[PDB]
Design an enzyme around this catalytic site. Structure first.
Site, PDB file in Angstrom:
ATOM      1  N   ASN A 265      28.352  26.104 -17.774  1.00 46.94           N
ATOM      2  CA  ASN A 265      28.171  25.455 -19.032  1.00 46.94           C
ATOM      3  C   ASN A 265      27.116  24.345 -18.736  1.00 46.94           C
ATOM      4  OD1 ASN A 265      27.889  24.051 -21.450  1.00 46.94           O
ATOM      5  ND2 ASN A 265      29.870  23.381 -21.619  1.00 46.94           N
TER       6      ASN A 265
ATOM      7  N   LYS B 229      25.502  22.138 -20.441  1.00 45.87           N
ATOM      8  CA  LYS B 229      25.712  21.166 -21.360  1.00 45.87           C
ATOM      9  C   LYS B 229      24.391  20.818 -21.968  1.00 45.87           C
ATOM     10  CE  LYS B 229      30.313  20.305 -19.894  1.00 45.87           C
ATOM     11  NZ  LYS B 229      31.471  19.281 -19.629  1.00 45.87           N
TER      12      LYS B 229
ATOM     13  N   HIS C 125      34.728  24.307 -27.573  1.00 44.66           N
ATOM     14  CA  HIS C 125      34.547  23.533 -26.547  1.00 44.66           C
ATOM     15  C   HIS C 125      35.093  22.137 -26.806  1.00 44.66           C
ATOM     16  CE1 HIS C 125      32.774  21.078 -23.012  1.00 44.66           C
ATOM     17  NE2 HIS C 125      32.900  22.167 -22.284  1.00 44.66           N
TER      18      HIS C 125
ATOM     19  N   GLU D 233      34.384  19.254 -26.333  1.00 43.26           N
ATOM     20  CA  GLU D 233      33.258  18.203 -26.679  1.00 43.26           C
ATOM     21  C   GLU D 233      32.805  18.530 -28.082  1.00 43.26           C
ATOM     22  OE1 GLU D 233      30.391  18.957 -23.671  1.00 43.26           O
ATOM     23  OE2 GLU D 233      31.592  17.994 -22.281  1.00 43.26           O
TER      24      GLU D 233
ATOM     25  N   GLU E 179      40.621  24.079 -20.861  1.00 41.41           N
ATOM     26  CA  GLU E 179      40.084  23.101 -20.717  1.00 41.41           C
ATOM     27  C   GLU E 179      41.369  21.823 -20.444  1.00 41.41           C
ATOM     28  OE1 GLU E 179      37.041  22.884 -23.666  1.00 41.41           O
ATOM     29  OE2 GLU E 179      36.155  22.118 -22.006  1.00 41.41           O
TER      30      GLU E 179
ATOM     31  N   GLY F 105      37.909  12.512 -17.031  1.00 40.49           N
ATOM     32  CA  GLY F 105      37.607  11.105 -17.241  1.00 40.49           C
ATOM     33  C   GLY F 105      38.579  10.219 -17.538  1.00 40.49           C
TER      34      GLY F 105
ATOM     35  N   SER G   3      37.948  20.592 -13.737  1.00 38.34           N
ATOM     36  CA  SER G   3      36.928  20.342 -12.629  1.00 38.34           C
ATOM     37  C   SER G   3      36.898  21.460 -11.480  1.00 38.34           C
ATOM     38  CB  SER G   3      37.294  19.035 -11.884  1.00 38.34           C
ATOM     39  OG  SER G   3      36.552  19.123 -10.415  1.00 38.34           O
TER      40      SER G   3
END
Lengths: 246, 246
Positions: free
Chosen positions: A9, A11, A93, A95, A163, A169, A209
């Site tokens: 991906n 992005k 996804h 996001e 995911e 983060g 990750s």
């Protein structure tokens, strides 16, 4: 019978120059016979990437809408995606869900339409930090997967991507054991709610990750069938993640 | 003195073959020198459209995001748009706002970034049937225009598009006098709030229903400087709309 799956991906990254360079690298990589490789370029470059990539690597759109054509400024349809030579779409996804507020209802409808239109779908699910800490990981990802399953007839065209949104983060990270746990609970959901057949043949890829240093330990988890790769998908390092089972 | 401007918003329509045909028709038609023509293709086809279209026609993206690169699956940046040879971006289109829930604040951030990167901006504003029948047309469109204005340092690269969202898909139609009323009030906002320089030079184009037969009359309205065309921009009819002054 589950072929190892590695999705890159990209992005919202890259330009024709830097992506051209990366594509050249991947065109020279030996992709294993046991491994299916897909790159998801920025939407502006689906066409470009398909023209420059070698057929051994498939092209995915990073998203799409739910009808073939319409008054939807800014959207692309599965028809356009196929028209550019891509054979996959990424849907749901993290996001899209958590930055852009894409609902489950919407994602299910995109899945149905992408599948009806002949695309493969990389269908993403996963739980945020608050949800994981409340104990509702199972609920959250089962519900998400239920919505996707309701819109799938042919599971041969689907790859599930977990995911760990709670680890992105946040100050937390997922161990390979934590990844394996969610993936075997998802396979149990497929065996239970669809068929042992579907469970045994459906790739569940890991979308947390992953790097060259971590990919072999992650790939050796019995229920982890590959990766949806972020940052490392823009680097020759992607080739090392592709070689994870070798 | 303000250059007549026609933007063709293709929205989520067309494939390489059908768009190739339309591009052929446009290439073949003569754009009058006094008019500026811009076409906004689906995002999968920005690059394709730019390569097929004569230099006389400019290409716009239908939307973009507010950073140069990042973790935003499904988005494209002004850098990518420029990299593709496009020089315009459409921002705040009613479909973005009302189908996809893009906030004014988000739309302001996009304008700021798009302008910073060297792109033209077709910035869209407009009231719903809700807001017009509540008598708050002025409040809505001025507040929308304010957020835009706060993220513009160079008005020479900005076109304002008024979209009567109240009169499109609702059963209500808008008269040229209703178009002119809002356009006049917007220009007066710019005068009051920015500068006479900006008010007198900034194209305010009409984004409601434009046909080959409605365009001459709409165009002759003194504060209507052009059009952002929906359905008709997918047809040879666009030529007629481009020639609305002739």
């Amino acid at each position: 019978s589950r072929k190892f799956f590695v999705g890159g991906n990209w992005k919202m990254n890259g330009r024709k120059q830097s992506l051209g360079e990366l594509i050249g690298t991947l065109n020279a990589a030996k992709v294993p016979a046991d491994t299916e490789v897909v790159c998801a370029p920025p939407t502006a470059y689906i066409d470009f990437a398909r023209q420059k990539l070698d057929p051994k690597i498939a092209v995915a759109a990073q998203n799409c809408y739910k009808v073939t054509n319409g008054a939807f400024t800014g959207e692309i349809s599965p028809g356009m995606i196929k028209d550019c030579g891509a054979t996959w779409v990424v849907l749901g996804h993290s996001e899209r869900r958590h930055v852009f507020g894409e609902s489950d209802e919407l994602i299910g409808q995109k899945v149905a339409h992408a599948l009806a239109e002949g695309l493969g779908v990389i269908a993403c699910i996963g739980e945020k930090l608050d949800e994981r800490e409340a104990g509702i990981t199972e609920k959250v990802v089962f519900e998400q997967t239920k919505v996707i399953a309701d819109n799938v007839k042919d599971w041969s065209k689907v790859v599930l991507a977990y995911e760990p949104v709670w680890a992105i983060g946040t100050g937390k990270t997922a161990t390979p054991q934590q990844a394996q746990e969610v993936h075997e609970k998802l396979r149990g959901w497929l065996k239970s709610n669809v068929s042992d057949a579907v469970a045994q043949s459906t790739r569940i890829i890991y979308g947390g990750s992953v790097t060259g240093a971590t990919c072999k330990e992650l790939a050796s988890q019995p229920d982890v069938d590959g990766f949806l790769v972020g940052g490392a998908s823009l680097k020759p390092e992607l080739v090392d993640i592709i070689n994870a089972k070798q």
